[PDB]
């Protein structure tokens, strides 16, 4: 919007081309992570965790 | 909305297959004798003169 781009011009903070779609704990529950399993397609480089 | 220009007239099922049969009782023509015309298995005269 015009006000948004005026704000960007004043503060010089450019936008981000990526969207935060991270997985997060559901609201209300509080646990302890006991297991993480990573499955990867057979064409993709494996990260250090995998 | 849009519309579809039908290549031939088509009866409305609500005004034909309802039990009072508005099409049937408007012409004083029984529904059994109208479904035969709509099924292309009988002819019906239309102002064929006296």
């Amino acid at each position: 919007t015009p006000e948004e781009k005026l704000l960007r011009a004043i503060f010089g903070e450019k936008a981000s081309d990526v969207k935060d779609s991270s997985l997060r704990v559901p609201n209300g529950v509080s646990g302890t992570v006991i297991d993480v399993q990573v499955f990867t397609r057979d064409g993709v480089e494996k990260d250090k965790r995998a | 909305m849009g519309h579809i220009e039908l290549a031939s007239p088509t009866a409305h099922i609500w005004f034909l297959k309802s039990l009072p049969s508005r099409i049937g009782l408007l012409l004083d023509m029984p529904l059994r004798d109208i479904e035969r015309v709509l099924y292309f298995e009988s002819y019906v005269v239309i102002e064929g003169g006296m």
Partner: protein, 471 residues
């Protein structure tokens, strides 16, 4: 049997079962009838000067390379041979035009027709020559209606008098000018309509100046072309009606691939009508050998275009189908479902292309699909609208338009107007540096600096605390 069931496929079977199949000789006889009808139509067309000159204009285009020969002729009975035969046809046409001056013109019909009938045309342009005469017949017959409507019923002229005088000459004014001293109630009343009737005859006699043929010769040939087009059509009706069972024996195989059973025996019927037009009995082959290719080509092409909501092209249908029989020939050669890497070395294409083919979306799930352990919940009850903006985000916009309204009010009227123009605030389209230069008469560069200082003021604290909460 009429009428017991609704069953629109059963009614079709009941209708089509009353025609008996053709023997090996009945097909030959019907093909001969079709050929005779088409030959009569071609003979009627080949008695027209308009077709000759049109073909000459088309060959003139070809001599200028404005058209192809293959766009005009479907073979003969060689480009250099074609050109010299066209030169011979042009020589025949010019000598016919020179000798057309009644007695010799009668023999010019039999000589010119021998040349034009030796060329085989294309179906697309041959109808144009037929349409050249169909429009010609409409214009003549339209003028024929008016003569009946302006002399018989208007002036109470007897209908038999319209046959005694008008029917037989149709060019002279025996019924127009010579029919005034007949002592009739219409003879003295034809003067009122004589102004338009004669001009209607002038339009009718202008037709005599269009093609060089009499009014009778237009109707004497069109009646032969209305029997030729009606004899070849009645014979093609008998060949299609007799072979309607051939389509059902083919269309029963493709019965559960997206189209109803009636949608297949109706797309096959269009292919059956295509085989009758192109069937040639001079090869001595059965009709079922040739018609099965056209029926199977129309049913199969129909499934490629009408079975899926999101339509994929035929060239991508022939790749999914190939991939669906290669990956099932490796099911029984390996014992388990293969992997996209192994199809790549088997189908001879990169894995990326195969991954695209396997990623083609299938038929979408109906939104009335029951999704729980009950008939209550449906798939459509869980699909949300993502095009709406949240009222938390919508009430932030109305708070930003007020926060930037007090801030701009704290600037000079010159900088509170160039900022409302460099950014489209509370108005239409924003402007560039030059477009606001004409507004204030200032140069482009200074406004860039005027705006820069306005931007500089707002970065300072005590005028930027609330603004920083919006990021």
């Amino acid at each position: 049997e009429i009428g017991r069931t609704t069953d629109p496929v059963r009614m079709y079977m009941r209708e089509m079962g009353t025609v008996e199949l053709l023997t090996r000789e009945g097909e030959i006889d019907i093909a001969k009838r079709i050929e005779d009808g088409i030959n009569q139509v071609q003979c009627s067309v080949a008695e027209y000067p308009e077709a000759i000159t049109y073909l000459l204009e088309q060959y003139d285009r070809v001599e200028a390379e404005e058209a192809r020969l293959s766009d005009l002729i479907t073979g003969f009975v060689d480009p250099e041979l074609a050109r010299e035969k066209f030169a011979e046809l042009r020589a025949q046409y010019v000598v016919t035009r020179d000798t057309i001056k009644h007695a010799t013109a009668q023999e010019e019909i039999l000589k010119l027709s021998e040349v034009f009938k030796q060329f085989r045309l294309v179906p697309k342009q041959f109808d144009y020559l037929v349409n050249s005469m169909r429009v010609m017949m409409d214009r003549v017959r339209t003028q024929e209606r008016l003569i009946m409507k302006l002399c018989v019923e208007q002036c109470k002229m007897p209908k038999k008098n319209f046959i005694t005088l008008f029917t037989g000459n149709e060019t002279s004014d025996t019924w127009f000018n010579a029919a005034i001293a007949m002592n009739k109630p219409w003879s003295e009343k034809l003067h009122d309509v004589s102004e338009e009737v004669h001009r209607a005859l002038q339009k009718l006699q202008q037709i005599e100046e269009e093609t060089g043929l009499t009014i009778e010769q237009v109707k004497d040939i069109n009646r032969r072309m209305s029997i030729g087009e009606a004899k070849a059509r009645r014979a093609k009706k008998e060949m299609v009606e007799a072979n309607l069972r051939l389509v059902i024996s083919i269309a029963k195989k493709y019965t559960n691939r997206g189209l109803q059973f009636l949608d297949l025996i109706q797309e096959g019927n269009i292919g059956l009508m295509k085989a009758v037009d192109k069937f040639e009995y001079r090869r001595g082959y059965k009709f079922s050998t040739y018609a099965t290719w056209w029926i199977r080509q129309a049913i199969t092409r129909s499934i490629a275009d009408q079975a899926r909501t999101i339509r994929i092209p035929v060239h991508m249908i022939e790749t999914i189908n190939k991939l669906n029989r290669i990956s099932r020939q490796m099911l029984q050669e390996m014992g388990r479902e293969p992997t996209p890497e192994e199809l790549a070395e088997r189908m001879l294409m990169p894995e990326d292309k195969i991954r695209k083919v396997l990623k083609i979306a299938k038929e979408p799930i109906s939104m009335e699909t029951p999704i729980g352990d009950d008939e209550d919940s449906h798939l459509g009850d869980f699909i949300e609208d993502t095009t709406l903006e949240l009222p938390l985000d919508s009430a932030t916009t109305e708070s930003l338009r007020a926060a930037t309204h007090d801030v701009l009010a704290g600037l000079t009227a010159r900088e509170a107007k160039v900022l409302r123009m460099r950014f489209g605030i509370d108005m239409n389209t924003d402007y560039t540096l030059e477009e606001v230069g004409k507004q204030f008469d200032v140069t482009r560069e200074r406004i860039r600096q005027i705006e820069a200082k306005a931007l500089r003021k707002l970065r300072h604290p005590s005028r930027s605390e609330v603004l920083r909460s919006f990021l």
